[PDB]
Nucleic acid binder design. Structure first.
Ligand SMILES: Nc1ccn([C@H]2C[C@H](O)[C@@H](COP(=O)(O)OP(=O)(O)OP(=O)(O)O)O2)c(=O)n1
Ligand SMILES: [Ca+2]
Ligand SMILES: [Ca+2]
Lengths: 953, 397, 392
DNA sequence: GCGGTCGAGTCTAGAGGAGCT
DNA sequence: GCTCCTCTAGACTCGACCGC
């Protein structure tokens, strides 16, 4: 048969695939290791449990070059990284004449040979270059000038906008309005410079790859967040001499030293305008040349060191493949932006109207001095300034009578007009209204006067009082010595109406000294109440200044920060604030994405000849400015795209990922790894304990747990102590990353404020103590972290020089234990990219890498090759899992993690094909007003049937 | 207290309690508005007219008859117009036969005019005139506010504000979406609770796409406005013959325009706005200042009454000349306490209350009370009109 | 011909067969174009203001177009019959001669009826409005609506005021209303002598007055006044009397009813005839188009932004403006002036290169036919002043 | 001669980033 | 574990024109 098992009864890979990947023969498991694993599982009650076997999979994999799987990947990476490493070595060995004396001014690229002789060229016509792009921010996103160096001669380029004296150009950009350019393009933060290249926006892929000196610096001598903070503050500390920030000046000082670079105080591109840039063209070109030469020196001093710390070519090939991200967009992106902005403005107006209504209704408490009994508006200024001073039906009137009555009424009205002199020349500002209401209303003399309390806003200290916000049934209160907070009634020691607080809390408790929190704070001395501060993220010492901050949205969604009385417009304002938080915090980034629309001529023949194609539509591409190694863990960082945000039914603009739509004739093929980091930790523990999958309790639970049934790690952790899944997921991921007991205690206190510090400490200790489920996995992480040169256990990538124990002694261990897992994940991504590119090139599959968000991989594959692409994704996943097992000493692979659960084939980048992505900005849905049918999610069995079990067409 | 009772007492609704039920109000078979309700509906219609015609390019007024030519449609329920004289003649002049009476009844369904159910047909008949007015250019539109009759037996009357938008099919969808968004914004502009105005897409029996606005009444949602994306079939049916006269210039080409039908219900809209105003505390109707039937209320106390009434009459004449609705509460013979008068003005959605006391004859100061804040501000008479005009202008824009 | 000139300018609509005097006076077809509709709306607004806003104890009334309907034979108003009933009669049980007779009788006996006058509409709201005014007589009810009269059904838009008064003061109020209506009709006419009044007597001997406009074919009644007494109020309210008694000082009395009804369609036709090189000198408060915006000599974008702003300016102020700059056809200046004269445009605005240079816009007055320069900032104030002046 | 609003000055909390323009 | 920055916003404070 095709079924293989394990001494722990875990289904292993099928014979057909096992003989192709791991070969034949194998090795008999050791009796002692199996006995120890059985005893360990029996002690935790994880032995003998039933497990339904999965259907066997048989497939003819492509010829694996070399002996083992490792040699196959090495050959693939060396073949992929040969033409770029050749150009890199040519740059290293290149000799370059000094900078030209006077730069040219004509449009297009200019070649500067010996003695600074100018010569125009359409394109550099060179294999390798070092790039640096300057763009006039005021004018737009179009690049202004660019200076590049070549082993042959210097080059420079200036846009037509800078040279030509033409008037303002069109807003929409075109590939013809970009810098023209196998090829290698090097630079510092080259992701930015990549977006200004003409050939980088074509749907068809050109053989161009980018090496970012910032990513290599982070891979060689990167700095953590705490390390970055310490380095910035200063400029045990022996690591500061070997590390630097991502700035080009700091990198140049660290790697080459010498005269440090000085940033130009003129800042013509950042702050100035086109005229200033034109005036100081020579100085700007000199600064750009200085930056280019510094980048060249940094690359020369980094490339041999990077190749020595990362000898496996798979890492380099993956870093080259992470920098070619291509997000296709269409005319729907502009719609999305306009709808989101309009919805945000409408909801802001509605919230402002609700606040004004609350303020207007609050004034009625003045009558009878009822404001003294209001729990919120008792302490405000309710003074009022006095004003200042310096029969039977008669018949119808006749014409003369009505005329004389009208004229005498007019004259009597006009007589009182002479009393203007008796009025003060400086009129009072709403004396009848109370004191606090006068501030919220503009004066009648103001040219921008609006009716009612038009100056009221969320950020003021009266909005929480007007909304009657309560924290766990306690009205909010602002103390100047302690910021915000809340009052807890029941104490027995204008006067605050503590009886009103007691009545409100009784109502809240019945309808839904006895409280723990930030502290009673008896210094405030509010009669009949105590003053507990609102829990701030920074700590108890800090004081909150606004209960509407972004750190209170989870606290108000839980039903703790609720709007009390005035429920008509009260909770509506809070709901609106919750709805528009994402757009408020990220509208600047989303609306500033550099969108370039391709002409119909540049589009491939497949797109134009498709039934779904529209002649009036515009298809563009957004190139993410992803730093391929933005952290010490070498994971790509991008605030806008590389995030965990997903479309929500109560968030404005949350469907931005759904707007990345494949062009006609192409489809987006994607796949998400199921618990990548958890599986990596589990397999590390298994290889450390007994050399077989499932020997550790953590690995056995990972392989056998299922979210649906309720055996997964997150669900069990949530059920152990009663927390939400997402909170339990955060807890478990932090624990795997290496978070101590203090992190667990603070997370427990933050998620549930009712937990005291002692109870949180006890619960954290119980959870960490579980001789435990993950002990061997951790012992392995500590061993790897504490080694002389901590290297990845798969590709052998060395850790940052700023984290080596030779320069940090016994410090920075929590960083290294997380670095091990995250760098293993990054190596997994690299292997995935290398294998996918090899499969695409070998079997002639038309597609390109789209994006890699977290643990997801997206490919813009032609539609006709969508199933072939899915089969390729399954094969690459199998190969990567087998390589990971092989590098750890395990020549086998469990069947449960061998293949993807679902390889998505969709027209957009939604998280799941079944989701419709309804949001206050797009309430109808993606299919309703855009034309996006639901995609297809296929398992390996479904893919095999539709591909005949082969990759050839 | 129920809102309907408050409206009836303050003359926003009219009728017996049998006519104040939800079904009676929704049917429209009876006059359901008092003078304050009539003024509120007039203000709403004026706002709609301004927004949809005055501030919009190439939208023109059209007038249509209440009667339409008779039709032999299979299931038309529109009521027929029959001359009683002809019936009396037939029945008491020559004593016809049973077949003659059958034929006469058949003729009542073949030549008798029918009351219009929608304003769409009226605008289509004036399509050629508006084409000539705009030199056959596109896109133009026709707007009309009128009474449409709907079967309920009884006949129900509802006031409809209809915009018929002619545009080429290439821009039909974008125009439909823009009109839907504009109508939603217009309905939510005067709403104290804009979240109660909804929108949903609907399809007819013939498969045409369109939207339909809703308002969340306490009993449930009701369709207050409907949008339909009608093809060229309506124009072809209304003009059976040469197509040259139907084609409109879409720039450099002649295209038969695609008809968009935007139909609102201003009676149900006024009911919705009266429900939105009441909170559902001081009983107060928080109607928008652009919709409040009465904006200024005058009063007189602690005489001499002759001089105070003369001054109040002068102020009333000054306010009326500027387009401000004023309620002359000083002329009322029966006097009530200021508390009851303030409650009455608040329940009548009166924006401001002006009290002219005997001290006004000396310095010209008057007591101004606002509905929103219930606060009294001492203001000089010469500055009242300018303040009211500025307040109304700011509340409009 | 005035009729052709109004038809070509969108004041009058309809086929040439519907442009006859009988067709125009019958009201069987929509006789007004968009400019005619705007002029009629302006006239209705003037009537409403002068009779309600500037009047004491006059209130709005909204009434149905259908009446409960009754057997009374003299009635000639068209009836309302459900077609479904007739279809059921003719395509089902197939009744006989007697049953058809009974069905026809039931149509006249119990069915709806189209209104012929707005008098009955206000009488149904008499109690509610009496309670509104605390039963203080006198008070009136005004309404502008369409009434149906047999000629085919003719539609006429009638502005009617029902003035409730004690019996003793009926004649004085009737004479006051007559003189007020005559002054209002003569106010907007360049030839007030064409409007006239003549006493008339009803069939039941009730005294009244009528207002006539001297059309080129003869005199037509544009407004009619009656002294109806308490007959109509008692007819509409049988039974108890204490519920229809107003207050006349200390004593209570059933108020007399005065019917002030005018035809605003015939009034619009009369004013169009009075307004008549072909020039229509409509009253400034009645003119549908007051401001005409024009460009000249280029450039296009800047001048259109100029004229565009001058237009939002005059629309926010409340002044109707004809956007003559957006026209693709580049007609001659004299042709534009003649067309604006025909369309009764109050003032024409010309925007040229000098406007971009200095800011002056040439203003042409229809009445004097003279061209004058004026700054942009002073155009709105001048227009508002001119409109205020005319209105008084 | 003196106090009433008004205009900066400052102090502080939140927010975005720790790159390239 | 937990620095820095530049920034916007809000509110308290105090000197100061100016009108009574
Ligand atoms: N609390 C978490 C959760 C996830 N991740 C990271 C690791 C994953 O590779 C990636 C995607 O994880 P998801 O949360 O999307 O999915 P999980 O892997 O957690 O699986 P599940 O959601 O079923 O628990 O994000 C993390 O750092 N911390
Ligand atoms: Ca750069
Ligand atoms: Ca996943």
């Amino acid at each position: 048969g095709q079924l293989r098992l394990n001494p722990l009864l875990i289904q292993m890979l099928s014979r057909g695939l096992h003989e192709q990947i791991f070969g034949c023969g194998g090795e008999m498991p050791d009796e002692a290791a199996v006995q120890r694993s059985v005893e360990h599982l029996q002690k935790h009650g994880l032995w003998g449990q039933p497990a339904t076997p999965l259907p066997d999979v048989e497939l003819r994999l492509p010829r694996l070059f070399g002996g083992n799987l490792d040699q196959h990947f090495r050959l693939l990476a060396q073949k992929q990284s040969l033409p770029y490493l050749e150009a890199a070595a040519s740059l290293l060995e290149a000799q370059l004449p000094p900078e030209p004396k006077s730069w040219a001014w004509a449009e297009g690229w200019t070649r500067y040979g010996p003695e600074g002789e100018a010569e125009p060229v359409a394109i550099p016509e060179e294999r390798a270059l070092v790039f640096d792009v300057e763009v006039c921010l005021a004018e737009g996103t179009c690049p202004t000038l660019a200076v590049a160096i070549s082993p042959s001669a210097w080059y420079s380029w200036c846009s037509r906008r800078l040279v030509e004296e033409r008037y303002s150009w069109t807003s929409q950009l075109s590939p013809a309005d970009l810098i023209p350019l196998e090829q290698l393009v090097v630079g510092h933060n080259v992701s930015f410079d990549r977006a200004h290249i003409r050939e980088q926006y074509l749907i068809q892929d050109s053989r161009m790859r980018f090496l970012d000196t910032m990513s290599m610096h982070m891979a060689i001598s990167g700095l953590s967040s705490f390390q970055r903070s310490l380095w910035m503050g200063a400029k045990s500390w022996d690591w500061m001499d070997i590390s630097s920030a991502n700035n080009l000046a700091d990198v140049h000082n660290l790697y080459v030293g010498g005269p440090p670079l000085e940033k130009e105080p003129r800042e013509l591109f950042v702050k100035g305008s086109m005229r200033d840039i034109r005036e100081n063209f020579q100085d700007l070109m000199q600064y750009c040349a200085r930056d280019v030469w510094a980048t060249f020196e940094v690359f020369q001093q980094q490339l041999p060191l990077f190749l020595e710390r990362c000898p496996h070519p798979v890492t380099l090939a993956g870093m080259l493949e992470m920098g070619v991200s291509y997000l296709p967009v269409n005319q729907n992106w502009e719609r999305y932006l306009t709808e989101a902005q309009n919805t945000y403005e409408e909801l802001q107006r509605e919230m402002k109207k609700s606040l004004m209504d609350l303020a207007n209704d609050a004034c009625q408490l003045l009558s009878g001095e009822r404001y003294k009994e209001d729990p919120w508006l008792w302490d405000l200024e309710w003074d009022l300034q006095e004003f200042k001073q310096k029969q039977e039906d008669p018949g119808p009137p006749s014409e003369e009578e009505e005329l004389q009555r009208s004229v005498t009424a007019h004259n009597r009205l006009q007589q009182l007009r002479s009393t203007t002199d008796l009025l003060p020349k400086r009129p009072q500002h709403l004396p009848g209204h109370p004191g606090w209401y006068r501030k919220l209303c503009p004066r009648l003399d103001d040219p921008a006067w609006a009716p009612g309390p038009s100056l009221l806003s969320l950020q003021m200290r009266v909005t929480p009082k007007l909304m009657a916000l309560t924290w766990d049934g306690f009205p909010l209160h602002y103390s100047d010595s302690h910021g915000w907070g809340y009052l807890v009634p029941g104490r027995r020691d204008v006067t605050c109406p503590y009886r009103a607080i007691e009545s409100l809390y009784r109502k809240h408790c019945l309808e839904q000294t006895y409280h723990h929190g930030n502290g009673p704070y008896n210094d405030v001395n509010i009669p009949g109440c105590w003053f507990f501060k609102l829990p701030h993220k920074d700590g108890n010492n800090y004081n909150v200044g606004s209960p509407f901050a972004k750190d209170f949205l989870p606290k108000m969604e839980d039903g703790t920060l609720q709007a009390g009385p005035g429920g008509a417009s009260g909770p509506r304002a809070l709901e609106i604030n919750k709805m528009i938080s994402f757009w408020r915090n990220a509208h600047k980034r989303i609306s500033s994405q550099m969108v370039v629309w391709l002409p119909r001529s540049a589009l491939p023949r497949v797109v134009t000849r498709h039934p779904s194609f529209d002649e009036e539509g515009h298809y563009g591409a957004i190139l993410p400015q992803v730093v391929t190694a933005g952290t010490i863990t070498r994971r790509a960082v991008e605030p806008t795209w590389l995030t965990a945000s997903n479309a929500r039914p109560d968030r404005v603009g949350s469907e931005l990922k759904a707007m990345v739509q494949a062009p006609p004739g192409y489809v987006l093929v994607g796949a998400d790894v199921d618990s990548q980091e958890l599986w990596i930790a589990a397999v590390l523990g298994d290889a450390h304990f007994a050399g077989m999958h499932g020997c550790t309790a953590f690995g056995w639970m990972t392989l056998q747990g299922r979210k649906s049934r309720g055996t997964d790690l997150h669900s069990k952790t949530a059920a152990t102590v009663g927390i939400s899944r997402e909170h339990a997921k955060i807890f478990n991921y932090g624990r795997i990353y290496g978070a101590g007991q203090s992190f667990a205690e603070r997370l427990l206190m933050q998620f549930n404020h009712r937990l005291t510090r002692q109870e949180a400490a006890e619960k954290a200790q119980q959870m960490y103590a579980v001789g435990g489920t993950e002990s061997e996995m951790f012992n392995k992480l500590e061993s790897i972290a504490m080694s002389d040169t901590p290297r990845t256990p798969v590709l052998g990538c060395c850790i940052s020089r700023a984290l080596e124990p030779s320069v940090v002694q016994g410090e920075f261990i929590t960083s290294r234990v997380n670095w091990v897992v995250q760098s293993s994940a990054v190596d997994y991504l690299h292997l995935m990219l290398v294998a996918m590119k090899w499969l695409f090139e070998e079997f002639a599959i038309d597609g390109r890498f789209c994006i890699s968000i977290h643990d997801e991989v997206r490919y813009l594959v032609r539609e006709e090759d969508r199933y072939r692409a899915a089969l390729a994704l399954q094969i690459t996943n199998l190969l990567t899992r087998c390589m990971f097992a092989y590098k750890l000493g395990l020549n086998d692979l469990p069947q449960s993690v061998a293949f993807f659960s679902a390889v998505d084939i969709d027209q957009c980048l939604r998280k799941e094909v079944t989701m419709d992505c309804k949001t206050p900005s797009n309430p109808t849905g993606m299919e309703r007003r855009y034309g996006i049918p639901q995609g297809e999610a296929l398992d390996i069995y479904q893919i095999i049937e539709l591909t005949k079990g082969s990759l050839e067409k | 207290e129920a809102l309907v009772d408050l409206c009836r007492r303050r003359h926003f609704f009219s009728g017996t309690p049998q006519q104040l039920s939800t079904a009676a109000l929704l049917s429209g078979c009876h006059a359901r508005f008092g003078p304050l309700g009539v003024e509120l509906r007039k203000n709403l219609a004026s706002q709609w007219w301004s927004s949809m015609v005055v501030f919009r390019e190439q939208v023109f007024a059209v007038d249509s008859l209440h009667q339409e030519p008779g039709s032999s449609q299979p299931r038309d329920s529109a009521f027929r117009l029959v001359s009683p004289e002809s019936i009396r003649e037939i029945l008491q002049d020559r004593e016809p036969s049973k077949e003659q009476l059958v034929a006469f009844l058949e003729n009542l369904l073949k030549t008798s005019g029918k009351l219009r159910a929608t304003l769409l047909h009226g605008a289509l008949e004036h399509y050629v005139n508006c084409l000539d007015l705009v030199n056959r250019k596109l896109p133009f539109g026709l707007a009309q506010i009128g009474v449409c009759f709907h079967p309920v037996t009884r006949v129900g009357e509802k006031t409809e504000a209809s915009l018929v938008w002619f545009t080429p099919t290439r821009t039909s969808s974008q125009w439909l979406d823009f009109w839907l968004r504009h109508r939603l914004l217009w309905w939510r502009k005067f709403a104290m609770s804009p979240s109660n105005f909804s929108s949903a897409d609907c399809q007819d029996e013939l498969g045409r796409k369109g939207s339909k606005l809703y308002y969340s009444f306490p009993w449930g949602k009701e369709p207050i406005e409907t949008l339909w994306n009608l093809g060229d079939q309506e124009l072809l049916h209304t003009y059976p013959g040469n197509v040259s006269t139907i084609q409109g210039r879409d720039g450099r080409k002649n295209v038969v325009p695609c008809v968009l039908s935007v139909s609102g219900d201003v009676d149900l809209g006024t009911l919705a706005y009266l429900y939105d105003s009441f909170q559902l505390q001081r009983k107060v109707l928080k109607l928008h200042p652009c919709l409040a039937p009465i904006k200024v209320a005058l009063d007189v106390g602690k005489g001499p009454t002759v001089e105070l009434r003369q001054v109040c009459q002068g102020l009333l004449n000054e306010l009326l000349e500027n387009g401000i609705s004023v309620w002359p509460g000083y002329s009322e013979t029966v006097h009530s306490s200021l508390e009851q008068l303030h409650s009455k003005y608040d329940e009548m959605s009166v924006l401001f209350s002006v009290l002219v006391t005997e001290t006004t004859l000396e310095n010209g100061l008057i007591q101004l009370r606002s509905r929103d804040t219930t606060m009294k501000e001492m203001m000089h008479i010469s500055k009242l009109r300018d303040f009211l005009v500025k307040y109304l202008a700011s509340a409009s824009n």
